Ligand binder design. Structure first.
Ligand SMILES: *[C@@H]1O[C@H](CO)[C@@H](O[C@@H]2O[C@H](CO)[C@@H](O[C@@H]3O[C@H](CO[C@H]4O[C@H](CO)[C@@H](O)[C@H](O)[C@@H]4O)[C@@H](O)[C@H](O)[C@@H]3O)[C@H](O)[C@H]2NC(C)=O)[C@H](O)[C@H]1NC(C)=O
Ligand SMILES: *[C@@H]1O[C@H](CO)[C@@H](O[C@@H]2O[C@H](CO)[C@@H](O[C@@H]3O[C@H](CO)[C@@H](O)[C@H](O)[C@@H]3O)[C@H](O)[C@H]2NC(C)=O)[C@H](O)[C@H]1NC(C)=O
Ligand SMILES: CC(C)(C)CC[C@H](NC(=O)c1cc(Cl)cc(Cl)c1)C(=O)O
Length: 654
């Protein structure tokens, strides 16, 4: 078929080993900035001692720098608090003697080239969080629950509040936080007060009361608020940093139930609502651009109690794709894929030339199922969850099983090149996988119960593989390390030698394999989401299309660190299909027309009563968030009020 010529030579001088000696217990690994190569490894022993190593060559070599931390014990609960973007900021938290007035931290702002010791006025309880806007601003919680802020990269710390439960950095250096009063975080549960500060402690606005918890997702601020003289609670949303609030058109839940933001962006949110009682599943709801109107998207969606596992996944390598796990009435688990932001859900197409397993009734008719967080959690033989990278268009890699449900059997690895529309067995049996050079190189390692010395690699998007021995002395493989963003050609293999054990990391550079830099000819045209090429509206997902330039399976070259995915939108004509029913409307039968509700029951009535103005004055239809269609159809009707249809049954006072 097709394999790389004279590869053994191209990799030998490019392979780079490093023996880390030690390293019983902890082994933390942190990348520090993009296009640097700075990696930091932190090993903690016990009677103990700590050991820190720094690389600058993508993990090909390290230099022990415990010296830079004046040789002290470092707490791994806090780990290595790394700064955003290329701020080069690193914050290690030291262990102090019991009687101390406050903690101690080591800090670098120069990619771990120089560390600064700093004693604190408090004892940290949380990892110091960096502001997304300014890397010099940090916030933390004391063991006393006081909110401490710093405006000088942890040099000077000022307590800005005292009974803080949870705090979070918003956009433009804002800080959101809850506070208790009568006892503790656990006590005042659902009775807490949500606050905000834009002047890092100077002023404070109470932005909520009877708060159970809060969270940020995309453009929204969600907070669960507890019912007056009741154990139940419901979601409320603010798109204006707490200033204005509005109840979410979602069910209310009990103390034994939860809400989880499965996914959030500038357009909408995927919200998991736990089903009442120990079920180990809930319901997925997709929001509108206001984060208020919700559409039931998926039933019996696996999500163990509390949080807890979920197989919910954003297939980051193709627009609108998400795979998750649903629970069958006959207590089996099925994988469901959505190509249109959870509009429509369906089974994953089984690979063409693939046989159905013992889980399936028809031996010729079944689907692909994916092993993710939940499978992993059940000590099922899954070394890795599904992996997709946004720069590697259409590629999805996962351990799955072809059949009617997720099977306990030892999984093989499956790949997709079109974002989950079509699948193919990539490798037999479990493996650890990585995407290099934006789909230029796919790299694999077998999940053996005994030592290994080989790395498998592909240059044709997992269609053809090649074995390569990287070491004479095999190792008990532990994991892989590659620079986030899947742009490098440097992969770090990690393990430990057979015993008197010692950790080691062989780092291969694939620079000589892809000695040729890609050029215009190497890329071909690809219409994302193609189903029927005859159809004019083919590839129309969420109102538009996208034509890509993708490197040929054929072409075997380097896309380069500067690689820019080139895509091109084709704006489609609006149809009813680009609209969700606003509040008080529903879609009966196969029909796409949003019909007015005969009567509003459950939580629709709750909102119909306890809700508000704009959301109730419904146009009947709303444009799907992220929907960029133009022309065609539009709901030709006036903005009509509904706080009459509910109240029409209630005897009303004067
Ligand atoms: C599922 O995964 C998808 C792929 O990762 C997610 O979609 C991607 O979302 C990102 C971020 O929204 C889009 O990338 C760009 O992000 C920037 C935001 O960065 C900063 O830009 C400026 C300058 O700093 C400023 O506005 C802020 O500081 C921002 O923080 C946007 O400004 C760009 O316009 C652009 O959106 C990707 O384009 C997008 N890709 C795809 C394939 O969709 C998706 O959101 C995930 N799904 C959910 C529901 O979360
Ligand atoms: C794999 O790892 C090697 C190091 O082991 C990486 O090498 C680094 O290569 C970059 C260029 O690609 C060098 O950056 C510098 O860029 C400026 C321009 O901004 C230029 O003026 C400098 O002369 C230099 O090229 C970097 O110094 C170099 N580092 C080392 C230690 O060799 C390599 O980039 C990694 N491979 C991939 C594909 O990411
Ligand atoms: C308004 C929100 C942001 C959604 C929080 C609301 C709260 N959330 C949680 O308890 C919770 C939190 C996490 Cl991080 C994960 C899980 Cl699975 C559950 C609830 O259920 O009242």
């Amino acid at each position: 078929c097709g394999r790389v010529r004279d590869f053994v030579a191209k990799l030998a001088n490019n392979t780079h080993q490093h023996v880390f000696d030690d390293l019983r217990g902890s082994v933390s690994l942190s990348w520090v900035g993009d296009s640097t190569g700075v990696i930091l490894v932190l090993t903690t022993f016990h009677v103990g001692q700590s050991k820190l190593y720094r690389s600058e060559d993508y993990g090909k070599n390290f230099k022990d720098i415990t010296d830079l931390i004046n040789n002290t014990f470092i707490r791994t609960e806090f780990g290595m608090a790394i700064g955003p973007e290329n701020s080069g900021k690193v914050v290690l938290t030291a262990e102090v003697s019991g009687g101390s007035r406050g903690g101690r931290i080591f800090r670098s702002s120069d990619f771990a080239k120089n560390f600064v010791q700093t004693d604190l006025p408090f004892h940290p309880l949380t990892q110091m969080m960096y502001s997304p806007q300014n890397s010099d601003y940090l916030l933390a919680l004391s063991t006393e629950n006081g909110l401490w802020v710093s405006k000088n990269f942890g040099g000077k710390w000022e307590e800005i509040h005292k009974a803080v439960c949870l705090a979070k950095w918003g956009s433009d250096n804002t800080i959101f936080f809850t506070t208790y009063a009568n006892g503790s975080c656990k006590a005042d549960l659902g009775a807490l007060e949500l606050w905000r500060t834009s002047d890092l402690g100077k002023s404070f606005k109470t932005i909520g009361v009877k708060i159970y918890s809060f969270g940020l997702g995309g453009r929204f601020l969600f907070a669960s608020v507890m019912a007056d003289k009741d154990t139940t609670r419901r979601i409320h949303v603010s798109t204006d940093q707490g200033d204005t609030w509005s109840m979410a058109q979602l069910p209310s839940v009990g103390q034994e139930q939860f809400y989880s933001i499965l996914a959030a962006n500038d357009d909408m949110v995927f919200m998991h609502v736990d089903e009442p009682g120990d079920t180990g599943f809930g319901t997925i709801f997709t929001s509108d651009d206001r984060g208020i109107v919700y559409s039931k998207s998926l039933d019996r969606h696996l999500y163990t109690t509390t949080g807890g596992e979920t197989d919910f996944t954003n297939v980051t390598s193709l627009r609108g794709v998400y795979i998750t796990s649903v629970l069958s009435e006959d207590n089996s688990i099925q994988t469901m894929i959505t190509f249109d932001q959870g509009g429509r859900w369906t089974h994953l197409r089984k690979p063409e030339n693939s046989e159905c397993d013992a889980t399936a009734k028809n031996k010729n008719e079944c689907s692909l199922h994916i092993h993710a967080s939940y499978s992993i959690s059940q000590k099922l033989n899954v070394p890795m969850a599904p992996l997709s990278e946004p720069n590697a268009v259409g590629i999805v890699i996962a351990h799955g099983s072809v059949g009617d449900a997720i099977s306990v059997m030892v999984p093989d690895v499956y790949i997709s090149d079109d974002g989950g529309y079509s699948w193919t067995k990539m490798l037999e049996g479990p493996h650890y996988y990585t995407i290099l050079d934006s789909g230029g190189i796919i790299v694999a390692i077998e999940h053996s119960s005994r030592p290994i010395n080989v790395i498998k690699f592909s240059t044709d998007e997992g269609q053809c593989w090649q074995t390569y021995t990287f070491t004479r002395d095999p190792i008990y493989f532990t994991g892989l390390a590659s620079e986030p963003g899947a742009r490098s050609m440097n992969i770090s293999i990690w393990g430990f030698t057979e015993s008197t054990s010692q950790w080691v990391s062989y780092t291969i550079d694939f620079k000589d394999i892809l000695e040729r830099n890609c050029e215009e000819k190497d890329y071909t045209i690809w219409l994302a989401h193609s189903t029927d090429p005859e159809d004019y509206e083919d590839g129309c997902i969420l109102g538009y299309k996208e034509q890509f330039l993708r490197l040929r399976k054929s072409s075997m070259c380097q896309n380069g660190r500067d690689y820019v995915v080139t895509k091109q939108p084709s704006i489609c004509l609006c149809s009813l299909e680009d609209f969700l029913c606003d509040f008080g409307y529903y879609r009966p039968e196969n029909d796409s027309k949003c019909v007015e509700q005969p009567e509003l029951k459950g939580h629709d009535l709750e909102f119909c009563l306890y809700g508000r103005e704009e959301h109730l004055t419904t146009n009947g239809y709303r444009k799907i968030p992220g929907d960029k269609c133009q022309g065609g159809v539009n709901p030709v009707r006036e903005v009509k009020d509904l706080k009459k249809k509910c109240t029409s049954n209630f005897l009303s006072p004067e």
